[PDB]
Design a protein around this ligand. Structure first.
Ligand SMILES: C[C@@H]1CN(C(=O)c2cnsn2)[C@@H](C)CO1
Ligand SMILES: C[C@@H]1CN(C(=O)c2cnsn2)[C@@H](C)CO1
Ligand SMILES: [Cl-]
Ligand SMILES: [Mg+2]
Ligand SMILES: [Mg+2]
Ligand SMILES: [Mg+2]
Ligand SMILES: [Mg+2]
Lengths: 194, 194
């Protein structure tokens, strides 16, 4: 019933553009929207985010997260390891590579989502959410060696999965960070389950 | 270590702006970024709210109340938590309850309210509070709930069993062209992984 009539460029950067979208509402009245797109998609999705479950025997299972300065936020954020998918890269392979780049951990694919939207009221940005286990007793994950690309500055934070939401709250209390909304949503449902 | 040096407007629309961000990297070298921001944010602790509405009904499995809408940035239909921007002066909790009623018809009760969390921190400064709300499905007010959608809002309600959330989302995605939001997917994944 609803659909795009046309898109008008308002401004294009190197990395992102701002558009004016004309669309037909379900009454048959034409209406406008301001929409953000990345310039980089060429792919299933712009990005992957990795849910990394670090499993060591005799330890709590942890979820591995990253802390980075995010310039749009003017501050530090806690997030799932993530990055954009390279043209020709599959989302699984992007996940494995981003996890290793950002955390040094070498993981196995558990499962992969379809493309899901990041902020659909503002942007067309999508990601694949890729659940990955990390055999933390394996020698290759003993001294995880992070291989950052140029400009990445990434602290690794592993938190127990059984207390994730309280631990994220506690960090926000002392550290003055912003937790990512997908991270917080996952942490909430861990508490809300059963 | 890292901090914002300057924020230069590139293009300001009615609803969204693009900025050139200049910041200090942690090697002591100046760098830049393209940042998206809303023009709507005032003294709000966040741009918006998203509601996690748990419909509770005696001798029913608990359901998660979702909405399906056309999202002009995405050029298609998206399944999301009920959500909206916080009006000036409105509390996150008030905005969550109002948006939940407007979009679904249900009158909830506040359970919990997150700190401000980032929507897509590599791209924008947008934040929300994620507010968990219970709905007493056995109350007469929530019996045959009528949405009060605002001007240009067209929202369908989709209630899905919490105990089967992720498979139910996959079955909707299998049926038609429609995207599931990353926060909803993340929440449904965690329900599985617990
Ligand atoms: C159409 C207006 C603007 N708006 C947006 O969310 C928006 C539009 N383009 S970007 N963000 C809501 C406040 C609804 O009323
Ligand atoms: C500065 C570059 C571009 N980029 C972004 O994510 C980006 C930056 N501003 S908006 N999107 C990464 C691919 C690597 O760093
Ligand atoms: Cl798992
Ligand atoms: Mg990343
Ligand atoms: Mg990366
Ligand atoms: Mg809404
Ligand atoms: Mg609304």
């Amino acid at each position: 019933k609803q659909y795009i009539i046309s898109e008008e460029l308002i401004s294009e950067g190197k990395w992102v553009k701002l558009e004016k979208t004309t669309y037909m509402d379900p009454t048959g009245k034409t209406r406008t929207w301001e929409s953000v797109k990345r310039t980089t998609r060429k792919q299933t999705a712009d990005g992957v985010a990795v849910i990394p479950v670090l499993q060591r025997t005799l330890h709590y299972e942890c979820i591995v997260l990253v802390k980075q300065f995010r310039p749009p936020m003017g501050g530090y954020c806690i997030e799932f390891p993530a990055g954009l998918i390279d043209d020709g890269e599959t989302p699984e392979a992007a996940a494995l590579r981003e996890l290793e780049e950002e955390t040094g951990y070498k993981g196995d694919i558990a499962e992969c989502s379809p493309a899901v939207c990041m902020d659909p009221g503002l942007s067309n940005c999508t990601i694949h959410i890729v659940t990955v286990t990390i055999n933390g007793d394996d020698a290759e994950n003993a001294r995880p060696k992070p291989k950052p690309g140029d400009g990445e500055f990434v602290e690794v934070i592993s938190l127990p999965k059984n207390d994730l939401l309280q631990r994220l709250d506690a960090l926000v209390a002392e550290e003055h960070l912003t937790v990512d909304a997908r991270v917080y949503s996952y942490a909430l449902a861990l508490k809300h389950a059963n």
